[PDB]
Design a protein around this ligand. Structure first.
Ligand code: UPG
Length: 483
């Protein structure tokens, strides 16, 4: 079929590698779009703010046991935390008390089975980058998961060809041909579910809902109220959003994309509010100050998502066996560390974007207990610290003393972006942050043993040659400390 010579080269390459067809049909529609100049840009001009949503904390109704039992849980596990200097799955980092993201995830599942739903179904979406390590970490530590890993747990995401910028042909990189390929973002979950046959298998088995969340978000868990809300309101797709803080910078905001709908009368013309997501990579830099404005776009996507599985299966079947999420065209070199390697486009989607694919879509505001993201080492420090606690059901959430506000941790990006620098900052121990509204570390620093930070603290070293090492036991309150 289609159509340009570049596109055909992509189809051939993909088929030769036995990539499944649903992934092929999806990639190619994106390629067609990109070849017409689509970048995935969503300018401010194209959207508006959303201002009223229901709040989860206002809801009280719980779903029945059959509804809960129809619910599958899936965790995202396919990216690497490269910004924090990681070359393997982020879920493998230790978060609290000598346990990793993966450990807590498994414990949350174990707890649900014991207490809540005996046969609860759990899935991990792995990529080629993360699959072997996840599988090995599991074999050792959660054998009940490892049995059934290949068979039931893992959803393997697609690989799609990186395409050359100049031609839109598939990239050649003879030094490492695997670098000619990448997982096409978390938006790929739908394609992978469908293409694998797993989606149909789940519907056949009688599962009706899927709850999906980021691997780095240990807050996120099944909530019976959400399920009940969905049933009562007949929602096919639901996005959990948090009221946006200062700290929410790596992510997406909820938006409204403007339409008036025809009720078998042309007279009027009330218009449905069609919700959408704008990712950071979708915002033209010119409009970036707007994107950053936490008043204007005050609802931030958690990536806690609810999907009514039959509706999804059907939507896809009828859209040619695909879900037509807006492509995001990233620019990279084929090898990330070689700046001179061929320039590419990497085509990706975001799973949140599916809010636009359903007539019955919405969003609900949720508390921070459901959202403890780790995108940065500063996030990691807070989570590691006493600000965060482990619940009976193995979630990590803020200590009650915090009152739902995470401590604002601002760490000098020069020194604490990479995992190594961060480990250095805390070589002598993680400070108490539970009482700290904001901590700012500027320049090169180390915490001492047993430090306690309260109120608003700035630790500043402008010397930059020697580490300001905080003395053991120091209590810092509403102060600037300096050498
Ligand atoms: O190809 C991919 C890319 C990512 N991931 C995983 O998806 C999760 C989220 O990815 P990450 O890079 O951490 O977050 P973003 O894609 O920037 O942002 C997501 O998470 C934010 C909340 O933390 C939301 O605001 C954004 O809208 C949502 O897209 C993590 O578990 C990743 O490992 C995959 O499985 N496959």
């Amino acid at each position: 079929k289609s159509l340009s010579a570049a596109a055909q080269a992509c189809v051939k390459k993909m088929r030769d590698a036995k990539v499944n067809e649903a992934c092929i049909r999806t990639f190619i529609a994106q390629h067609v779009m990109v070849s017409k100049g689509e970048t995935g840009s969503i300018p401010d001009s194209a959207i508006m703010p959303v201002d009223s949503l229901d709040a989860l904390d206002s809801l009280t109704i719980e779903c029945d046991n059959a509804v809960l039992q129809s619910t599958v849980v899936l965790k995202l596990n396919g990216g690497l935390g490269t910004g924090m200097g990681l070359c393997d799955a982020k879920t493998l980092l230790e978060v609290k008390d000598g346990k990793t993201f993966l450990d807590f995830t498994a414990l949350q599942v174990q707890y649900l089975r014991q207490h809540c739903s005996e046969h609860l179904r759990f899935m991990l979406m792995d990529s080629f980058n993360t699959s072997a390590s996840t599988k090995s970490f599991l074999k050792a530590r959660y054998p009940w998961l490892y049995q059934v890993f290949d068979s039931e747990v893992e959803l393997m995401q697609n690989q799609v060809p990186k395409i050359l910028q100049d031609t839109l042909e598939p990239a050649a990189w003879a030094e490492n041909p695997a670098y000619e390929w990448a997982p096409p973002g978390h938006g790929d979950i739908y394609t992978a579910l469908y293409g694998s046959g797993k989606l149909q298998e789940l519907v056949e088995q009688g599962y009706r809902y899927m709850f999906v969340s980021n691997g780095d978000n240990l807050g996120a868990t099944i909530d019976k109220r959400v399920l009940a809300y969905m049933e009562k309101e007949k929602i096919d797709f639901l996005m959990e959003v948090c009221r946006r803080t200062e700290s929410d910078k790596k992510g997406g905001h909820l938006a409204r994309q403007t339409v008036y709908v025809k009720g078998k009368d042309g007279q009027p013309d009330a218009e449905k509010r069609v919700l959408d997501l704008r990712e950071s990579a979708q915002c033209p830099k010119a409009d970036m100050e707007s994107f950053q404005d936490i008043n204007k776009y005050s609802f931030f996507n958690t990536n806690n998502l609810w999907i009514r599985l039959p509706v999804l299966l059907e939507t896809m079947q009828e859209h040619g066996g695909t879900l037509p999420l807006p492509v995001i065209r990233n620019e990279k070199t084929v090898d990330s560390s070689n700046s001179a390697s061929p320039k590419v486009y990497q085509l990706e989607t975001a799973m949140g974007a599916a809010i636009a694919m359903f007539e019955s879509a919405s969003a609900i505001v949720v508390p921070r207990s459901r959202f403890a993201p780790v995108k940065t080492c500063a996030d990691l420090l807070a989570l590691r610290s006493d600000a965060y606690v482990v619940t009976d059901d193995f979630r990590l959430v803020l200590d009650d003393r915090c009152h739902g506000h995470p401590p604002v941790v601002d760490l000098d990006s020069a020194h604490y972006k990479m995992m190594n620098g961060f480990e250095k900052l805390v070589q002598h121990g993680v400070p108490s942050l539970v009482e700290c509204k904001r901590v700012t570390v500027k320049g090169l620093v180390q915490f001492g043993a047993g430090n306690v930070l309260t109120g608003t603290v700035t630790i500043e070293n402008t010397d930059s040659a020697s580490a300001f090492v905080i003395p053991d036991g120091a209590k810092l309150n509403d102060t600037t400390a300096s050498p």
